[PDB]
Amino acid sequence: MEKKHIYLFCSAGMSTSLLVSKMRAQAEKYEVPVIIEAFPETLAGEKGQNADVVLLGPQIAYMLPEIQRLLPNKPVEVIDSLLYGKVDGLGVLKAAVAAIKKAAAN
């Protein structure tokens, strides 16, 4: 079954969980076949290798150049501060899908 990988990275992996949970619940509601999981930044190399998009917490946004260095062939984007503060699952899900498409096409 065609499924895309959206992996989220922050220092510990735990505060992002609620955003992931909401993104998942809306992905279920709108029958979007995607795997959305959160991990610590240490596994950015190892797990990012199988990501279709890598999403970063605004708190580790300064590490975008360094993770870009780690994963130069994978679209690596930061989650918008306001969307994260608002915890708007759909907004972030759309941005993730949009980034996948700004890699595969467009």
Determine how many CB atoms are found less than 10 A away from the CB of residue 30.
9
Residues whose CB falls within 8 Å of the CB of residue 74, separated by 6 or more in sequence, listed in order: 48, 49, 51, 52, 53, 54
Catalytic residue among 8, 10, 34, 100: 10
Helix axes 17-29 and 89-104, enclosed angle (nearest 10) = 80
10 classed as catalytic:
yes
* Backbone φ, ψ for residue 65 (5° rounding): -55, -40
Could you give the CA distance from residue 72 to residue 2 in angstroms, rounded to a whole number? 24
Catalytic residues: 10
